[PDB]
Structure 1
Amino acid sequence: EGREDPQLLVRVRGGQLRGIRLKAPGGPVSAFLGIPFAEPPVGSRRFMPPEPKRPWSGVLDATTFQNVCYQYVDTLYPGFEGTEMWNPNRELSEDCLYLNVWTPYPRPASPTPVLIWIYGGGFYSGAASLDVYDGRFLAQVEGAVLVSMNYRVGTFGFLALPGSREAPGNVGLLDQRLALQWVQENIAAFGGDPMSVTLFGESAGAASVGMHILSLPSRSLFHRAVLQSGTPNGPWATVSAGEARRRATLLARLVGCPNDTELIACLRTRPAQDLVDHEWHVLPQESIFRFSFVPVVDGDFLSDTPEALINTGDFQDLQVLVGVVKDEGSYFLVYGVPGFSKDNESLISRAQFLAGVRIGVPQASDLAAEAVVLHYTDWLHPEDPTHLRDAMSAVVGDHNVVCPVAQLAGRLAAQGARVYAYIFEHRASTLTWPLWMGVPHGYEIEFIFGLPLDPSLNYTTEERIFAQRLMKYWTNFARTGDPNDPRDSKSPQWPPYTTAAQQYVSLNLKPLEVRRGLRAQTCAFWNRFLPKLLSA
């Protein structure tokens, strides 16, 4: 060293780092990108729990995003911004366990609350390096220290032969936990406060955050949690040991690998792409919003089902922010339900609605399905194509996200957690998905990370103010366990969600509005009746 920027040089447990000075609209920030936090999970380590990164020598360059974890790449709409913004933006590799850090420039004087982002992508995809996850705005405007980590996805992350030593399951979550430990040990070197760590994540990332809440070894590695449109409970976030063993065994067959040791050994000789090419082929039914390789109820990371754990856990010491977007279901319809397309209005028939329900509620017997159809039919207009379209969207959204969220918020509150709840209702003026899809899941993220503050992205002035509000809510919550601004009582307040009053707020361009009951009547159907109905 000698001529370099002295303010970009930092040591962590494994060695010296060189970061980069990024420009944000309001000033510079410090970024440390591609920090390895584990031994590369390759070769004989595929499917294995991660091991801490062995110290390196010299100054590791941390100025560029590293490899993204090997994964399926979406090709439904080739060249379309709405899909490609989620696609991997670095080389695919099994050597992918790296994390990223953004901090104020210069680094903060006093220790600073830390935000840790966990991406979604259905546990089969995702990357911490995507543009929508750019931590530079939160770091500059709110002074936050922001960490995001890559974690293994798909088979590499979640293929399990439960009980085995060579593929114990949930290693993708163990990747996440290793990164949380990394933060505890090392974040102070960046000016971050290890005694104030908030997890936040969207979709499968949100479910992941929920896993960490429910798994005892993770509990001492964070203090607060934000869950955006996802939950550890619900029909897609976990599988039984039995089902995971079935899926892993089937996948092995599909790639030529017919004792768990011998089988896993043969899978470890397969090229990564061969696994990805067959991953989607092991699902039990024709479905949407179901993923082949996800966290497994192993009796270890997860001592029991998330449902049982949220129903009996003690959460007196927890502060949780949760919420949903207005149209959780619309996105998935074009990926599997006949009649739906992003290029037309997707007006479907009654027949297509019934068929859609069987695909969107794949575990339902004929009776349960009919119950769903009867509940969601508008009997004043049972054949109106526009209603059926919107009803299909509501079915998929309610079943997979809104009602699992409503359940989680309710159980957490009842058991001593401080819960704050929202529904996000603003549609980005820059959205490229059609208008009928409303506010699809994933499209609040860019507002929470403050992308509209970047002039070049052509958001509205109103959207830039809105984005600032949201960043202020999230970082206030990070700091205090309370999204409300202390030095501001004039603005309307965000009350805690309680079982008695079930209050939550609308997040849009208009000031905070307090509402009661998260789809209360409908979620009673999904969360109380349907389980009893499927028991017959």
Structure 2
Amino acid sequence: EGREDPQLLVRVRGGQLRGIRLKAPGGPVSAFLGIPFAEPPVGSRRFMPPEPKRPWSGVLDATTFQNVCYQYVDTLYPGFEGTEMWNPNRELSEDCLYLNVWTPYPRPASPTPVLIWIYGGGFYSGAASLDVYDGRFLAQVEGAVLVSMNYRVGTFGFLALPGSREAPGNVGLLDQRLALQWVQENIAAFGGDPMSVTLFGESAGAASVGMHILSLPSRSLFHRAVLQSGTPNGPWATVSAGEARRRATLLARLVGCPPGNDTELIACLRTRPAQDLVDHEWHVLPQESIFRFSFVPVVDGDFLSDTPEALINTGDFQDLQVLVGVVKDEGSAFLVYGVPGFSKDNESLISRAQFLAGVRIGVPQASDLAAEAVVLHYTDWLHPEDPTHLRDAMSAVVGDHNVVCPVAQLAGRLAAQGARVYAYIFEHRASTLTWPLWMGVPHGYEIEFIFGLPLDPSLNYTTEERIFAQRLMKYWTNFARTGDPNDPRDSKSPQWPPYTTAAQQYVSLNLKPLEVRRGLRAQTCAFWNRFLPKLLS
């Protein structure tokens, strides 16, 4: 046939695809949703590296989002858009290694910069099919080819018996590398420039992006990287070999797979229903905690030849261009998932006791001395009992420790070692946010703006937000295009300068024009990055 829209028929290397023509506000875009890039990682392939997708015959239908990787569904606030917007919107299946491509309609005559999105979700949840990752706007408005992939999360993606053949760990990264490889090979068929691939992701996806920066076999598959609210370095994005070994073994035991070599154990895990692994995942953490996740990248001496901090300290990043940044309230969201005293349904004014308790959960790896050091640092000694400040300090601790200071260390090390870094703080609370006021601009809530959702008039964003969304997409795609988020023509708008060790410049993203600022929580991050380590004894 024959009768179909010729713009929707594309041949990639596994065979032919039929895409779908979608409405964006400013006009039509092409979508090729659910292109499979790996062999379904099921049965004997669980815990195993992805294998490239074997070619198919006929025209593969690529008009709808394919399955979401097997994962824990958040039931903290039943019916609450604030949590439900992050939950899976397609069937849960182990057969989920699919990707998506948005492109202009009609596809552009000459090659186009390619953004590749990697979702977040604590390496345990996430799905490229979620409303907030909808590439139609970037495609229609900026003329960009945008690609997002599903990668295996949780045990399926990250359970590791390091040194083993049957479960070597890091397979979720490997799924992402494979989507990356696929783009090199096929994106041209859609008018993307494979010589201009920019990786971007937020939170665990941001951490992912950083891992690709740090893994030799991924460096050839992209040219530019964007890390939103996450990093490879830090207390949560990786575990050591021993700790991953401990967690896998403990989970194995929990589902009735007693540990005594690795083959028997992994074989037994492979016989277990996927829902059983998910049901037991949370139980392997070493302490009561927040912003920690059971199955995450392992420092395997393979994908990661050393710890991320060792590699950012000694890596040569002679031109790499990265844009890094944070939201105003990185910590706030985490507090409702565990910390007593905190809730979305009230003001969360906590007591000093609740605060000391929170710091323990919030910095679980820290001794008595160190936890008391954090508390002394974040206490306002002028009002040391004030419920509002205590609440906000709890939020700042979780935020600073897990996101802001890792981001600061990242920028600093990169910049000091050849990279062109652009740094930002995103301060706009959405008008449409359902979370309470006290949470500020929570973790994840710049994404809807970077992706352009406010441009959809049916979504009820303000005109200001629509103009803002447009500004943001211009920064992002200018950066993709050029390595520089500035417009080479628009001299009147204030310029966004690179981040450097000498001046530590970064910009505010809010409804007002760009304001340049110096030092990203410089003083407090000296605490977390330089001092708190030295409380090693």
What band does the TM-score fall into relative to the shorter chain? Answer: over 0.9
Whole-angstrom distance in 1 between the partners of 2:122 and 2:237: 8
Whole-angstrom distance in 2 between the partners of 1:64 and 1:117: 18
Residues 229-261 of structure 1: per-residue CA shift (max 9 Å, x gap): 00000000000000000000000000000x100
Helix, strand or coil: the match of 2:147?
strand
Identity %: 100
Whole-angstrom distance in 1 between the partners of 2:13 and 2:425: 40
1:195 shift after superposition? 0.1
Whole-angstrom distance in 2 between the partners of 1:217 and 1:439: 36
Whole-angstrom distance in 2 between the partners of 1:314 and 1:65: 39
User: 2:133 matched to 1:133?
Assistant: yes
Whole-angstrom distance in 2 between the partners of 1:81 and 1:58: 40
1:517 shift after superposition? 0.2
Whole-angstrom distance in 2 between the partners of 1:326 and 1:470: 16
Whole-angstrom distance in 1 between the partners of 2:535 and 2:291: 21
1:305 shift after superposition? 0.2
Kept in 2: contact 1:114–1:198 (CA 8 A): yes
Helix, strand or coil: the match of 1:296?
coil
Q: Residues 33-52 of structure 1: matches in 2 within 5 Å?
A: 33-52=33-52
Whole-angstrom distance in 1 between the partners of 2:7 and 2:151: 29
1:309 shift after superposition? 0.1
Residues 418-460 of structure 1: per-residue CA shift (max 9 Å, x gap): 0000000000000000000000010000000000000000000
Whole-angstrom distance in 2 between the partners of 1:334 and 1:295: 25
Helix, strand or coil: the match of 1:160?
coil
Whole-angstrom distance in 1 between the partners of 2:53 and 2:418: 38
Q: Select which of 360, 369, 372 maps to 2:371.
A: 369
1:391 shift after superposition? 0.3
Kept in 2: contact 1:195–1:223 (CA 8 A): yes
1:415 shift after superposition? 0.1
Helix, strand or coil: the match of 1:91?
coil
Residues 170-196 of structure 1: per-residue CA shift (max 9 Å, x gap): 000000000000000000000000000
Whole-angstrom distance in 1 between the partners of 2:464 and 2:536: 47
Kept in 2: contact 1:287–1:360 (CA 8 A): yes
Whole-angstrom distance in 2 between the partners of 1:447 and 1:288: 26
**Which position in structure 1 is the counterpart of 2:416?**
414
Whole-angstrom distance in 2 between the partners of 1:303 and 1:526: 25
Kept in 2: contact 1:31–1:101 (CA 8 A): yes
Residues 331-379 of structure 1: per-residue CA shift (max 9 Å, x gap): 0001010000000000000000000000000001000000000000000
Helix, strand or coil: the match of 1:93?
coil
Q: Residues 343-354 of structure 1: matches in 2 within 5 Å?
A: 343-354=345-356
Kept in 2: contact 1:200–1:228 (CA 8 A): yes
Helix, strand or coil: the match of 1:218?
helix
1:487 shift after superposition? 1.2
1:508 shift after superposition? 0.3
Kept in 2: contact 1:30–1:102 (CA 8 A): yes
Residues 372-416 of structure 1: per-residue CA shift (max 9 Å, x gap): 000000000000000000000000000000000000000000000
Kept in 2: contact 1:187–1:193 (CA 8 A): yes
Helix, strand or coil: the match of 1:266?
helix
1:482 shift after superposition? 0.1
Residues 1-59 of structure 1: per-residue CA shift (max 9 Å, x gap): 10010110000000000000000000000000000000000000000000000000000
1:292 shift after superposition? 0.2
Instruction: Name segments (4+ residues, structure 1) moved above 4 Å.
Output: none
**Which position in structure 2 is the counterpart of 1:204?**
204
Whole-angstrom distance in 1 between the partners of 2:164 and 2:181: 25
**Which position in structure 2 is the counterpart of 1:181?**
181
Kept in 2: contact 1:213–1:219 (CA 8 A): yes
Residues 57-78 of structure 1: per-residue CA shift (max 9 Å, x gap): 0000000000000000000000
1:534 shift after superposition? 2.7
Helix, strand or coil: the match of 1:200?
strand
1:168 shift after superposition? 0.2
Helix, strand or coil: the match of 2:535?
helix
Residues 109-139 of structure 1: per-residue CA shift (max 9 Å, x gap): 1000000000000000000000000000000
Kept in 2: contact 1:348–1:385 (CA 8 A): yes
User: 2:30 matched to 1:30?
Assistant: yes
Whole-angstrom distance in 2 between the partners of 1:455 and 1:179: 32
Whole-angstrom distance in 2 between the partners of 1:213 and 1:508: 29
Kept in 2: contact 1:327–1:439 (CA 8 A): yes
Whole-angstrom distance in 2 between the partners of 1:256 and 1:141: 53
Kept in 2: contact 1:365–1:534 (CA 8 A): no
Whole-angstrom distance in 2 between the partners of 1:511 and 1:497: 18
Residues 484-521 of structure 1: per-residue CA shift (max 9 Å, x gap): 00111110000000000000000000000000000000
User: 2:226 matched to 1:232?
Assistant: no
Helix, strand or coil: the match of 1:320?
strand
Whole-angstrom distance in 2 between the partners of 1:157 and 1:137: 30
Helix, strand or coil: the match of 2:126?
coil
Root-mean-square deviation (CA, aligned residues, Å) is: 0.3
Residues 150-187 of structure 1: per-residue CA shift (max 9 Å, x gap): 00000000000000000000000000000000000000
Q: Which runs of 5+ in 1 are unaligned?
A: none
**Which position in structure 1 is the counterpart of 2:395?**
393
Helix, strand or coil: the match of 1:101?
strand
TM norm structure 1 = 0.99
Kept in 2: contact 1:368–1:534 (CA 8 A): no
1:317 shift after superposition? 1.9
Kept in 2: contact 1:364–1:534 (CA 8 A): no
Kept in 2: contact 1:162–1:298 (CA 8 A): yes
Helix, strand or coil: the match of 1:411?
helix
Whole-angstrom distance in 1 between the partners of 2:69 and 2:479: 30
Kept in 2: contact 1:97–1:149 (CA 8 A): yes
Helix, strand or coil: the match of 1:291?
coil
Helix, strand or coil: the match of 2:265?
helix
1:142 shift after superposition? 0.2
Kept in 2: contact 1:115–1:197 (CA 8 A): yes
Kept in 2: contact 1:421–1:504 (CA 8 A): yes
**Which position in structure 2 is the counterpart of 1:488?**
490
Helix, strand or coil: the match of 1:68?
coil
**Which position in structure 2 is the counterpart of 1:451?**
453
Whole-angstrom distance in 1 between the partners of 2:489 and 2:31: 30
Q: Select which of 285, 299, 303 maps to 1:301.
A: 303
Helix, strand or coil: the match of 1:140?
helix
Residues 287-308 of structure 1: per-residue CA shift (max 9 Å, x gap): 0000000000000000000000
Whole-angstrom distance in 2 between the partners of 1:53 and 1:391: 49
Whole-angstrom distance in 1 between the partners of 2:416 and 2:14: 43
TM norm structure 2 = 0.99
1:203 shift after superposition? 0.0
Whole-angstrom distance in 2 between the partners of 1:317 and 1:431: 38
Whole-angstrom distance in 2 between the partners of 1:452 and 1:534: 47
Q: Residues 128-527 of structure 1: matches in 2 within 5 Å?
A: 128-257=128-257, 259-527=261-529
Q: Which runs of 5+ in 2 are unaligned?
A: none
Whole-angstrom distance in 1 between the partners of 2:480 and 2:489: 16
Whole-angstrom distance in 2 between the partners of 1:199 and 1:372: 34
